[PDB]
């Protein structure tokens, strides 16, 4: 009798649910139907006169203008699926692969938005020629250093977090966020006072500021930049096409279907004053 | 991929799929109630 028992399968083919915290939700997303995007920022400001009644008025300053060129690279994947599967595998495999390809692209662009280099992928804020804060020029991201090489500072730990906050600019802190990974957030939550109580008080915010747990920032190494903080919505520009171009090819792999899907996305930092970093050097 | 401009993109990985079988066992109890109780015990003992 046991061949009459016909086990019911699931409704939707499930999967392991990996991280979707991809920095895209906090940055500036711009639709682009071109090959490159060009943001135009001001790196200086004007001058005001406080002009008197009847003396004179001269020429005042005018803000010099920087063009930053989003390269807008592409990101491509091509799974090979079988035609016998697609007709006989009652779960809708076309839209399931279209969901999983979109998930893989939203996860793989998170690594490029943070620590990707220039070659065929966006440049993250970490690869942007860091200069110690206080000697801050325009073409660089600022950092403050903690003290000791491996860990945080020794005698006074966690003010590296505070002066990093209050060295970011007053208008950028109005809507700013920390960016960390999980084994740095664990180490920050493990920090505790002289008694054994952890000194810090679903977004898991820190000092009132929201925290984006990435998985692609470096961990706390000797000279790594594990914690970043700033207004990424004004600081970082993501330029993209808001669709996922799928083309099925029954022709090269002949009994197969070979879904070639590729969305395209680019981006670097648009405002250098709006992101600060935490270095562990000295 | 992060496909280049002229790269001739070959195949990529495709997730292998695991089936886990819920066995769907049963759980049964059989209390023994008196017919004298059910007729004379004005609370609704069946739905209780």
């Amino acid at each position: 009798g046991g061949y009459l028992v016909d086990p019911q399968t699931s409704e939707t083919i499930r999967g392991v649910l990996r991280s979707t915290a991809s920095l895209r939700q906090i940055a500036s997303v711009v639709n682009v139907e071109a090959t490159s995007f060009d943001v135009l920022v001001d790196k200086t400001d004007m001058g005001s006169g406080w002009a008197s009644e009847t003396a004179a008025l001269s020429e005042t300053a005018t803000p010099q203008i920087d063009r930053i060129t989003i390269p807008l690279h592409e990101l491509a994947a091509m799974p090979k699926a079988s035609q016998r599967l697609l007709d006989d595998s009652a779960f809708d495999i076309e839209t399931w692969l279209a969901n999983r390809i979109a998930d893989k692209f939203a996860r793989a662009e998170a690594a490029a938005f943070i620590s990707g280099d220039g070659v065929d992928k966006p440049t993250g804020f970490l690869t942007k020629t860091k200069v110690a804060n206080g000697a801050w020029a325009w073409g660089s991201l600022g950092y403050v250093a903690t003290g000791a090489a491996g860990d945080f500072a020794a005698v006074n730990a966690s003010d590296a977090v505070v002066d990093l906050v209050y060295a970011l600019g007053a208008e950028y802190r109005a809507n700013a966020s920390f960016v960390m990974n999980s084994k740095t957030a664990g180490a920050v939550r493990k920090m505790k006072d002289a008694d054994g109580r952890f000194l810090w008080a679903e977004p898991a915010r820190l000092m009132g500021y929201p925290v984006l747990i990435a998985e692609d920032m470096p961990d706390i190494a000797a000279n790594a930049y594990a914690i970043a903080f700033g207004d990424f919505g004004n600081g970082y520009t993501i330029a993209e096409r808001p669709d996922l171009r799928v083309l099925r090819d029954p022709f090269s792999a002949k009994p197969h279907v070979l879904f070639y899907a590729s969305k395209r996305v680019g981006g670097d930092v648009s405002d250098f004053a709006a992101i600060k970093l935490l270095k562990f050097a000295a | 991929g992060w496909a280049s401009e002229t790269a001739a993109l070959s195949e990529t990985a495709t997730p292998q799929i695991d089936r886990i079988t819920i066995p769907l066992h049963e759980l049964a109890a059989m209390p023994k109630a008196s017919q004298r109780l059910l007729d004379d015990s004005a609370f609704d003992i069946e739905t209780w």
């Binding site: 699926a81 599967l85 006989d88 692969l97 | 495709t14």
Partner: peptide
Amino acid sequence: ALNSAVAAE
């Protein structure tokens, strides 16, 4: 998403 012959794929 591969062949229906291999069970795990």
